[PDB]
C-alpha cells in the first residue's frame, strides 16, 4: 500500500505543479521592467550597540522603533535603546545558548530560547522593576529556533523538533502544534494581521500555517537547502526567504509559487536573515560574508551593501515604522543603518 | 522634564555595564565545551565522572580553573544547526565508542561526523579534544579475534603500530595496532585540512580510567596558549 | 523541489554487478557534495561513499572500498554506484543522498534518521 500511496503522491504533487504553471504567465522580471530603480541604498551604521560577549544569535525591534532585545550565547538579553544607545535592561538567562529572541508588540515582555528546549518569558514591565521569568514554556522536542510574540498571551514557538507551536502563556501550555515539517524548523515571520504565519525548516520548503486551525495552508517549494530565515512581505499576501542555497526567493500567499531569485553568482554564502522596507521595495538579507546586501525586492539588483561586520551577520531587524536597519553579528555588535 | 529621565537612563546604563563588566570577568574566565557523541559512545560515563568527581549542563572545578561542560541531550540527531552555537567553545569533547560491537560501523559513522566538525566553516577554529572511550572493550574484541575491524577497514591488515606508540601494561601487539589505526583514521582527517586554526589531541580512555578531567585541563590549556601565540603569530 | 528519486536496484545473486543511477532535480548538481548511504534490515543508517563537487575527491566505507565505485555527471545532473562482487551482507535500500550546503566540505546527517534531502531509496537483494 506504501508504493501505490506513494504513486498518489507524485502524481497529486505533479498536478499541483501543473496548477502553478498554468498561473505562471509572466514574471516579475517582466513586468517590473517599467519599474525604475531605486538606485544606490547607501546606509551607513549610525550606532554600534555593543555590550555583549559572544555571538549576537537573534534580535527583534518593539512596536515604539526605540526599543531592541538583543540575545546572545554569553547568556544575555540585552533591551537597547536605539536612540540613545543606552541599555535599559539587562537580563541573564538561565541557558547560555539562546537561539532567539522576541519583543512583544506591548512591550511589557520579552522572550528567549535556545538548546534548553524552553522559551522562556521574561516580564520587563513588573512591579518591583526586577526582570524575572513570568514562564518557561517546556514541552519541545528540540531546540527552540525561533519564537515570535502573538499579540493575546499567545507565542508562536519554533523547535529543532520539526513541529511549530502556539503557547497559552498564562497556562503554560501549547494550544495548537503546527507539524508537516521534516526538517528542522529554523525561522518564523507572522504576517501583518497575525493571522497566518510561515515557517522555514531544513526540508527546502516553507509552510503557510492558519496559527487558529492548524493546518499547513500552503507549502512553498523552490528553494534548495535549509531555510534559514523567513520574513512577511509588509502586506501580508506574500514573504521571502534565505536559506543556505546563497539564494533569497519571494513566494506569494496567492500566486502559489516563486516571484523572484535573488542571488548573485558572485555570492556563495548562506543567507542567515531577510527583513523588508515599510513599503516592501527593500529586501535585505543577512549573509554569510560578514555583510547584509540590499535587494531590490522588485528587480532583484543589488541596489546597496551593509558592510562593516567583523563575522557572520545573524540577525536582521527593520523597526516597524522602517526609520532603521538593525543588523546584528557574530561579532557581539548590534549597529542600527540608516 | 526629560534631564532626569536621560540621566536616569544613563544610571541605569552604568549600573548594566558594571554588572556585564563583572559578568565577562566570569565569562571569559570559564571555559566552554562541547560534548559530543554517538550513540552509546560512553561519553555517558565520561559525564559522571566529571560530575561528581570534581540541553545538559555541567561545571567542574580542576586546577582553580571553571569549566562549562554541554552535554547536548534531547536533540534530535541531525546536528546541522545547532553546532553552529558551538563556535566560542573552546573544545568539542568528541567521545568515539572504538568498540561499539564486538549497530551498523559506528566507527565509520563517529569518523564521518568528526569529519563533517572539522570542515564546517564555522567551526574551522574549534579545536577538537578527542576521547577514543571503550579501549579496555577494544581489548578483548581484537585479542580474541572473532571479530576483525579489517571487515569494516580493509587498510588495517596493511597497517603497522606507529612508532609514536606508548602501550600499557598488558596492551598486547593486537590491540595496540587496534588502538592506534583508529587514532590515524581520526587524524587523517585532522591533517587534511585546516592547519593552525584547530588542532585534535586524541586520547585513550575507559569507564575505568579517571584522569579524563585532567586531560581536557591540560588541552585546554594547550588550546588557548595556541590560541594566544598565533595572535603574536609566534606560532 | 528537491527530487531524488533512484532507479537500478533489484534482485543479484552474489558475486554479480549493480548500477544504480540517481537522477537528480531540483538543485544544480554540480554545486554541493553528494554521496550514498544504505539502510540494512535491522534499522541501520551507514554512509557508503562520499563524492565531491567536481567528482575529484571520492571516499568509501571500508566495507565497500575497492569494490565499489561513484561517478557523477554534472551534465546530466546523476549520479552512479558500480557495485562490483556483491556479497550477502550488501543487502541493503540504499538511499542517494546529498549534503545540504553547496561550496561546503562538510557533508552533515546524511545518515540521519530523517534527512530531508535524502532520496527514498532502491532496495539492493543479495
Known amino acids: 500500500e506504501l508504493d501505490q500511496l506513494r504513486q498518489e503522491a507524485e502524481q497529486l504533487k505533479n498536478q499541483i505543479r501543473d496548477a502553478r504553471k498554468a498561473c505562471a504567465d509572466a514574471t516579475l522580471s517582466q513586468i517590473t521592467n517599467n519599474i525604475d530603480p531605486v538606485g544606490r541604498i547607501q546606509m551607513r551604521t549610525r550606532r554600534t550597540l555593543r555590550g555583549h560577549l559572544a555571538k549576537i544569535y537573534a534580535m527583534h525591534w518593539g512596536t515604539d522603533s526605540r526599543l531592541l532585545v538583543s540575545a546572545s550565547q554569553d547568556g544575555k538579553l540585552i533591551i537597547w535603546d536605539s536612540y540613545t544607545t543606552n541599555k535599559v535592561h539587562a537580563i541573564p538567562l538561565r541557558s547560555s545558548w539562546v537561539m532567539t529572541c522576541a519583543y512583544a508588540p506591548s512591550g511589557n515582555y520579552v522572550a528567549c530560547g535556545g538548546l534548553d528546549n524552553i522559551c522562556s518569558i521574561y516580564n520587563l514591565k513588573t512591579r518591583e522593576g526586577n526582570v524575572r521569568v513570568s514562564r518557561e514554556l517546556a514541552g519541545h522536542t528540540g531546540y527552540l529556533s525561533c519564537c515570535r510574540f502573538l499579540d493575546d498571551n499567545q507565542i508562536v514557538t519554533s523547535s529543532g523538533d520539526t513541529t511549530c507551536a502556539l503557547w497559552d502563556i498564562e497556562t503554560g501550555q501549547q494550544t495548537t502544534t503546527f507539524t508537516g515539517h521534516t526538517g528542522d524548523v529554523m525561522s518564523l515571520s507572522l504576517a501583518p494581521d497575525t493571522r497566518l504565519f510561515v515557517s522555514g525548516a531544513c526540508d527546502a520548503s516553507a509552510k503557510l500555517w492558519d496559527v487558529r486551525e492548524g493546518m499547513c495552508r500552503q507549502t512553498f517549494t523552490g528553494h534548495e537547502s535549509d531555510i534559514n530565515a523567513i520574513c512577511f512581505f509588509p502586506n501580508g499576501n506574500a514573504f521571502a526567504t534565505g536559506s543556505d542555497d546563497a539564494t533569497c526567493r519571494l513566494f506569494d500567499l496567492r500566486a502559489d509559487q516563486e516571484l523572484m531569485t535573488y542571488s548573485h553568482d558572485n555570492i556563495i554564502c548562506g543567507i542567515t536573515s531577510v527583513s523588508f522596507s515599510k513599503s516592501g521595495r527593500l529586501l535585505l538579507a543577512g549573509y554569510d560574508d560578514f555583510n547584509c546586501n540590499v535587494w531590490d525586492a522588485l528587480k532583484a539588483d543589488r541596489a546597496g551593501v551593509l558592510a562593516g561586520h567583523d563575522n557572520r551577520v545573524s540577525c536582521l531587524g527593520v523597526t516597524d515604522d522602517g526609520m532603521a536597519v538593525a543588523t546584528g553579528s557574530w561579532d557581539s555588535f548590534l549597529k542600527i543603518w540608516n | 522634564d526629560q534631564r532626569n529621565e536621560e540621566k536616569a537612563q544613563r544610571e541605569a546604563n552604568k549600573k548594566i555595564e558594571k554588572q556585564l563588566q563583572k559578568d565577562k570577568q566570569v565569562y571569559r574566565a570559564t571555559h566552554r565545551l562541547l560534548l559530543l557523541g554517538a550513540g552509546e559512545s560512553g561519553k555517558n560515563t565520561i559525564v559522571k565522572q566529571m560530575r561528581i568527581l570534581h540541553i545538559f549542563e555541567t561545571k567542574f572545578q580542576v586546577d582553580k580553573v571553571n569549566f562549562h561542560m554541554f552535554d547536548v541531550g534531547a536533540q534530535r540527531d541531525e546536528r546541522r544547526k545547532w553546532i553552529q552555537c558551538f563556535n566560542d567553545v573552546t573544545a568539542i569533547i568528541f567521545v568515539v565508542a572504538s568498540s561499539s560491537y564486538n549497530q551498523t560501523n559506528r566507527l565509520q559513522a563517529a569518523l564521518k561526523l568528526f569529519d563533517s566538525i572539522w570542515n564546517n566553516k564555522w567551526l574551522r577554529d574549534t579545536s577538537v579534544i578527542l576521547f577514543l572511550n571503550k579501549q579496555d572493550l577494544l581489548a578483548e574484541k581484537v585479542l580474541a579475534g572473532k571479530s576483525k575491524i579489517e571487515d569494516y577497514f580493509p587498510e588495517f591488515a596493511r597497517y603497522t603500530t606507529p612508532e609514536d606508540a606508548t602501550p600499557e601494561p598488558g596492551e598486547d601487539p593486537r590491540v595496540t595496532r587496534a588502538k592506534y589505526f583508529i587514532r590515524d583514521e581520526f587524524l587523517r582527517i585532522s591533517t587534511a585540512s585546516g592547519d593552525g586554526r584547530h588542532y585534535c589531541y586524541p586520547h585513550f580512555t575507559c569507564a575505568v580510567d579517571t584522569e579524563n578531567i585532567r586531560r581536557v585541563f591540560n588541552d585546554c590549556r594547550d588550546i588557548i596558549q595556541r590560541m594566544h601565540l598565533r595572535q603574536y603569530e609566534l606560532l | 523541489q528537491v527530487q531524488l528519486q533512484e532507479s537500478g536496484g533489484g534482485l543479484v545473486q552474489p558475486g554479480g554487478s549493480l548500477r544504480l543511477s540517481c537522477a537528480a532535480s531540483?538543485?544544480?548538481?554540480?554545486?554541493?557534495?553528494m554521496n550514498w548511504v544504505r539502510q540494512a534490515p535491522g534499522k541501520g543508517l551507514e554512509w557508503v561513499s562520499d563524492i565531491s563537487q567536481s567528482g575529484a575527491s571520492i571516499s568509501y566505507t571500508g566495507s565497500v572500498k575497492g569494490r565499489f565505485t561513484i561517478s557523477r555527471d554534472n551534465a546530466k545532473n546523476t549520479l552512479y554506484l558500480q557495485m562490483n562482487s556483491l556479497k550477502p551482507e550488501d543487502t541493503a535500500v540504499y538511499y542517494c543522498?546529498?549534503?545540504?550546503?553547496?561550496?561546503?566540505?562538510?557533508?552533515?546527517?546524511?545518515?540521519?534518521?530523517?534527512?530531508?534531502?535524502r532520496g527514498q531509496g532502491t532496495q539492493v537483494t543479495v
Open positions: 543522498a546529498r549534503c545540504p550546503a553547496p561550496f561546503t566540505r562538510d557533508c552533515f546527517d546524511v545518515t540521519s534518521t530523517t534527512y530531508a534531502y
Open positions: 531540483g538543485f544544480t548538481f554540480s554545486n554541493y557534495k
